[PDB]
Design a protein around this ligand. Sequence first.
Ligand SMILES: O=P(O)(O)OC[C@H]1O[C@](O)(COP(=O)(O)O)[C@@H](O)[C@@H]1O
Ligand SMILES: O=P(O)(O)OC[C@H]1O[C@](O)(COP(=O)(O)O)[C@@H](O)[C@@H]1O
Ligand SMILES: [K+]
Ligand SMILES: [K+]
Ligand SMILES: [K+]
Ligand SMILES: [Mg+2]
Lengths: 501, 501, 501, 501
Amino acid sequence: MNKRVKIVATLGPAVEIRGGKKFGEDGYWGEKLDVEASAKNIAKLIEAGANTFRFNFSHGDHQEQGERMATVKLAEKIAGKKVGFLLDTKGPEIRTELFEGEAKEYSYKTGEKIRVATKQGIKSTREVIALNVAGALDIYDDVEVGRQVLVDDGKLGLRVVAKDDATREFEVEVENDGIIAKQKGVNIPNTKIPFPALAERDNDDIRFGLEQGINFIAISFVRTAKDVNEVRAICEETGNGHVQLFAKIENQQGIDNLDEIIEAADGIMIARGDMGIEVPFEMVPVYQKMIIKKVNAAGKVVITATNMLETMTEKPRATRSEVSDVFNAVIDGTDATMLSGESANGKYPLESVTTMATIDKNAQALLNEYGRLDSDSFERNSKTEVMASAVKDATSSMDIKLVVTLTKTGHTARLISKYRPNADILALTFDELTERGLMLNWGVIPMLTDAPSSTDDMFEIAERKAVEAGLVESGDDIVIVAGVPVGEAVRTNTMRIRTVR
Amino acid sequence: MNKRVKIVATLGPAVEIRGGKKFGEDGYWGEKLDVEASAKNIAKLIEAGANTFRFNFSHGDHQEQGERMATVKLAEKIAGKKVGFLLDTKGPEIRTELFEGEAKEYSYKTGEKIRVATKQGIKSTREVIALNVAGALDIYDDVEVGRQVLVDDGKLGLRVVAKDDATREFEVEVENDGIIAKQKGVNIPNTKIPFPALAERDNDDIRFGLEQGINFIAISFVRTAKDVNEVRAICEETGNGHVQLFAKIENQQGIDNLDEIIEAADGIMIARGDMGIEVPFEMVPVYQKMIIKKVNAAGKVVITATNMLETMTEKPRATRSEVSDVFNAVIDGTDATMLSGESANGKYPLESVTTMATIDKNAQALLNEYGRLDSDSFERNSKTEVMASAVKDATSSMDIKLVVTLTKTGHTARLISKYRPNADILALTFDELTERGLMLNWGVIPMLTDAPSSTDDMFEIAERKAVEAGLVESGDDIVIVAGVPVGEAVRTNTMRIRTVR
Amino acid sequence: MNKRVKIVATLGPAVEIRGGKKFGEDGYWGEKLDVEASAKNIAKLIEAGANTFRFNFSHGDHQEQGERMATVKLAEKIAGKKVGFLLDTKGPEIRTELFEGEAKEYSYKTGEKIRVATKQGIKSTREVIALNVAGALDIYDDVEVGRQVLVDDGKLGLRVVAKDDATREFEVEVENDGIIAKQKGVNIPNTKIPFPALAERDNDDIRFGLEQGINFIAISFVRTAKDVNEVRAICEETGNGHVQLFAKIENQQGIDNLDEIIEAADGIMIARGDMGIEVPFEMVPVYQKMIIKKVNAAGKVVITATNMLETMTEKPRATRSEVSDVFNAVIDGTDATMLSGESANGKYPLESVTTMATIDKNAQALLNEYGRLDSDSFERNSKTEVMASAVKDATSSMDIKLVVTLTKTGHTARLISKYRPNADILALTFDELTERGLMLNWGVIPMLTDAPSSTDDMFEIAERKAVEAGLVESGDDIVIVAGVPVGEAVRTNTMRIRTVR
Amino acid sequence: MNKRVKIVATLGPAVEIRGGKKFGEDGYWGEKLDVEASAKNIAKLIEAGANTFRFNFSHGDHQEQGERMATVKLAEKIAGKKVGFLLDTKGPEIRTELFEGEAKEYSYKTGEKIRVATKQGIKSTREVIALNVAGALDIYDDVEVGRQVLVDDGKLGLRVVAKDDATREFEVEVENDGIIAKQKGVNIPNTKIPFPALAERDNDDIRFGLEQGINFIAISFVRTAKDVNEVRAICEETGNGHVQLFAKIENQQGIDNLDEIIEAADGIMIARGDMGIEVPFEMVPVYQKMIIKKVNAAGKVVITATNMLETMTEKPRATRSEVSDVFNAVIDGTDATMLSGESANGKYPLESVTTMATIDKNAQALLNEYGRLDSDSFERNSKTEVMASAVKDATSSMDIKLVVTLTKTGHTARLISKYRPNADILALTFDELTERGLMLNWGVIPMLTDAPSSTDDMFEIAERKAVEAGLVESGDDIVIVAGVPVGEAVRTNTMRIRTVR
Ligand SMILES: O=P(O)(O)OC[C@H]1O[C@](O)(COP(=O)(O)O)[C@@H](O)[C@@H]1O
Ligand SMILES: O=P(O)(O)OC[C@H]1O[C@](O)(COP(=O)(O)O)[C@@H](O)[C@@H]1O
Ligand SMILES: [K+]
Ligand SMILES: [K+]
Ligand SMILES: [K+]
Ligand SMILES: [Mg+2]
């Protein structure tokens, strides 16, 4: 069977060979990138069901990112299959500074009183922790006594007891035993540090990705619709209006402003990593189910992210909790599941994609029994959406092997996908940008074909493409929708039930 | 407002003028039928909402019946509207004989002991009641002691206490006070008197009707599939294969064998008059709701009959119970409601059809709130049925003014009607027999058009005929289904949502 | 097996014997009332399932009404069973006057122009119909050009085309052929003739009935809460606070103000006879279902009335539409069904009550499958209501033969009845006025017992009363509720499931 | 709020202090157990919401197990709170043999051909792996070609490609790069190695636990009902009939025989660790949801086990997939969640129990919205179960703070728990064995109280104990059930709604 749930795989050195050396091996970083050998490894990830690669601009300079994007373009040719390109922004990250010395880290013990500096471009000491704040902002007047400075995946807590106006330093109490290492993530929950709607470094990263050729931007730490619309204006003004924007929800402001963020964006990445530090970790499952429902109801794409097969970074088998998490993300209604370090940096990138594909394919078989999404509740808000509802009805009434839509922009395919039919969706489109642009919608198999003339039989074309793709065989029943005829129809207006010859 | 629930109106002398005289006036029967004046009265019933006329062969000879059927054909020309023609068989009727002397009736009291004669071709006396049994059957060995002989709409009960082998007479006890009049209906419940599957009189009646031109036969007292199959054989062998058969369910065997009868017939007439004598009267509403559900599930036609506006036989207003009965039959899911003496014999035939139409129209507006049928529960058992389900879905998703089907045989219109869409159904068909044969399906407006060729745009035809009929205006949304293209499609395979120009 | 739906039977001369003569026989009103003979006939209606008798003060003087009420008290002793006493007011009736000089009626044809006079105390002529308006009100200023004057159960329409200020006469045109007879009902729909909130004639009839001993008042033509509250004030003033008020809903204003009327009243009588003249007849079934739902959700009593078995006034069997109407009133959720002329004036009063009881008992068995009422949707607004919901739950979980409630005021029985449990409700109460006041609540069997002391076993009392009433036998499971213990409990606070010894 | 989902915490050296050393400090095992210091750590796990401690007899001899149980009895005194004692059996085990020349492990590469010996009492070589099978059984005739030998938590796969009848050796191909170390766990999925229903080692370990005093036994690798019944016979024979048996379902045979095992057991432990090696890993979520539903429908206890907070063994915070897993186990309907190495052997035992309790408490607030279990579907199979349903109804109708049951054996408390009321359940019981035996039922707070006397007010006692436990305050509404009168009632037969003073 075809895997309806889409996989986003983050790329990094794990798949990359450097003069015959694998990531980890001594001298690895001293060798030149073997592009063909790296492209062949990426090809296997595509074959195992990666539908989109994530280029995380938090790690690796423009040269590294651009070389990896080029390597994927070769892998597509090797695999015989296209994938989406997704750029993930750095955004308003706060990290611990480098320490004085060749000190890489210091261990602390509960109750121990230390300070954190707000002055930028200075090194840390054991007793005065400095921060690398995005854009070198001064955060002193934005964090109150009683606020928490969390270091490294929220592992070490520092309680702001007092503030020293003389040095612009936070006096903090170590809440629990743990280490402060250099260049680790810092979270300061329930604060509104005035990060700009779009920082110059993200502006620059996005413009670089847009020049290379991308299909999706995942915008880190979206707080408001303005954070999405600043990125949209770049995409539009550079001639890249086709690029789709996924707002990453990972803090309380993003949760509070979710409805306006969904309205501005093409989709949501549930960024559970930061989210579970910024809000109570036990609320993340609540927010996940609610986000997936609301995004599906808006006919947009939802990606569930972070830790999904975390153990497979270092070990060959996923835990039972990881398998349950992937499975339940599908039942919740996610369009897509994501890998981060598992595919980018781990010992088992191919096995991670394969394992996620196996779970995702099994979970899709239970959506009839257990799925949370309920298409019967939707308002049908347009005639294309009325047709999408009729398609879902036909797939419920009888055994339909495949829904085919002839779609110029993918709008019809997006609306069919919204309704989660009991069938794969072959989206026949007429340009490569629309084709790749569909690769994260649940159930959709995008395929490039010639735009039909007013003299072509679009129903015979649908059947022939489905056969050429190996998706159907003689005696299978398919549902085909189209705008008929070409030049008269203003939208998808026809549904045909056809038996394959 | 189109009336979706269909009306069967029994014709009789009430609408018929004879040498300037209306029914009721002395010497009426001594004058000859005024055909033109009578056709003008019938055209008013057609205009008021009568969709089919019932010719009851229990009353009036082949001359009365044939002249009435000719008079309707003129009425259709006057109204500019066609109607269905339904023959209702006499069947295995038992009536009281004429009395010796010139006695018209005797009155009896609870406990009196009299006899019922089984000998055919004699006259009744006060003490020995003679029966006129269909086909002159001897019923003596077919009714046990403890059975009941009911005279005149079940009003007087006679208990069989003993049988006189010498005279072949039932000794009976009068069960309640009442009258035995001449030529009154007799019922003997929970007996299996071996009336033939098809009596010669019903054979001859049906053959006469088939010659005149009928669309429907309602078969009285259907007990088994064989009672229906014997009539089907005559229709087939006379080249009247198009004629549709309604089994009348009006005794316990009909109820017991209901599934096999529904399988053999095209529809059911719920013949509540006899039914509520032959079975406990308080079970009739239970059987009504059950039969409507079952016949609708089978994709067949159900007619609810008898006493629906009974008071309007004598009075110009129906009782509160009559209006409630018509309203509730629609809510239960009936395709059609019927009038017997109200339209045939009463003082207010036109007002009876008008009153029924007004109630049926109001009740159809409450089918979304109160409607008992549930199309969501059906197995979609064919590709045409899957398309019918998708049409229903489209009419639930958005405001659809009309569904149009291009239907050679009516099959697509019957399956759309089964699903009870929130829309009228325009059934475009290519012969008059198919057209009239759709006149009792819920919501169907049959309309004759030229068979489309492979060069015709069936979707433009649909819009044109709907605009011509005055059913849609500019801006209305319609659903159109057809088998496209003509000569290649083996069935209805296409649905279009179209805005009227 | 127990009849849960209650029957209100209207009393009159039909059951009354006079010097050995039955109603309709020659010199009937010549003879004196045989009280003992008449009381034996009424006891048979009690035994057949009449739960309350209606005394219609629209007909017969105080002496006739008081004697009839005395006859019922004897009938209760003969039957060994108590019934409720219900007074139905005259209210604001309009009747046609006597005609000039002994004359009875005239016939009229469509388009004919006559007058109706508003002056009170004068006789009609054929040309000038006079009205007997309740309280001799002058209606001339309260009826607009464009209204209709309907005579005799709405059968003849008179359109008001002009008004003659000189004579205070309506110039009317006959809308349809028909008859104006002396002393027939007149309706003038959608008018607000300023009938007082309480007329003197109704005050005097209500104070009379209260002096005789009644349990219920059904207030004709209720328009607002004020019409109910005026009668409440009489009941309060006279120490008859226990008397329950049923608003009769029978015009558009009553329908428009239904919510505030239900609030003010103890219940609603759906007075379909006048309603179906004052509003479009085809709307009565919609309003009937809606009123039953709203009154039940309020925890109050609804009576469905008028024409339920109308044919049985004159014939020994009801029509199929009459049986359907009674059956469907039960399915709709009525607490009670009513007989008017069928029990008061017809030839078959006993058969009418028996027939209604048979239908009501069969319909109650189909409430699980078809019942319109939905107790799952109610807000449980008090702890007694939560206990009523839990009782319903227990009767759905297992086979419960009987629910018993020990109730001082009947509150707990009313709430249990509201929930329509799958069981009869035995209401053990401690005074006859409470007992009689429960006789129209669905499923409630009221029974008089001593008030339990702090020392009594109320669960043993419940079982003993149920066994002595013949409602349960050994091995039956019952649900008993009570306020335990007496003296400490402030409401019904206990549910016990008990197996009968 | 009170935590309704129960926590099973496995005990081990993580919480144990030995001469002032914590587990993993140098010379830990050289110091003797500090019983007080260990009991103080254990008391903190109780206070954090551990409801039952698991004593895993797979690791540690009788002396270590008995000393650990004594330390828990002191911890209960420190906490002022009791916990359940659960014995987990060693059960059938296969382990890799020691290697010749005291070698520790060998590395192997995908595609290598090696051998597996079935001959017992023999050492492994790199080329010929030998197995230590429980009872030294000969495996050869139980394993067919196409089966797998999986080594070390299923990390290394060996496909059986051929068998050699002369050496009784399996020819295996290495399926992935990995290590075969000495004395590691081996799984052979989908085989029926004839391990005894109850091995002597398990028989002896169970008798030791029963003599120490336990409340639960979890039976490892239950394959059929006989594996439960053999343990039940030992509980019955030794006078320990109160001990409850949880079948561990962890292989294909246990799943195939689930219905008969649920019938024999008191509950199920979903042993996901072994299950996800023994069945396709992607099927575990399917089986988990199905087992929870079936065990709850049977009125029995289900524990979801293994890897729930696995990362917390080494790190102070759980992953997003782990929090999701715990949350979703609650939504699926689990009675209890379990910790293994997280509480027994990790760095953060107290943090692991606190985190699991935080997640379980948040998830229970979403059971109304998202809960999978459907109590409306259950057949109520006894009168106690009817009362449990009524209790649920009361908690759905109004805001109920607490359900109190006075329960002699816990049966009523088990049935209320089965229905998952919107309330905590205080189970007032009269002996410590019944008390401890309720500690894993969802929502049940067991509390030892004096048996009520014939003159006691059990409803007053319920209120008093609820206030004593701190579960209610003034104005709260509670539901109380009991068998009334005490001792004479055959079962719980009474429900009261009471307002707390
Ligand atoms: O029916 P809707 O939602 O208004 O959408 C109609 C729009 O869809 C489009 O058909 C695009 O649809 P496709 O890209 O699927 O062909 C536009 O041409 C049209 O304006
Ligand atoms: O889809 P189903 O139920 O098998 O029906 C197919 C049959 O219907 C027909 O199309 C008739 O349909 P119409 O009469 O509505 O045109 C036949 O040609 C065909 O064999
Ligand atoms: K990032
Ligand atoms: K009255
Ligand atoms: K174990
Ligand atoms: Mg009235």
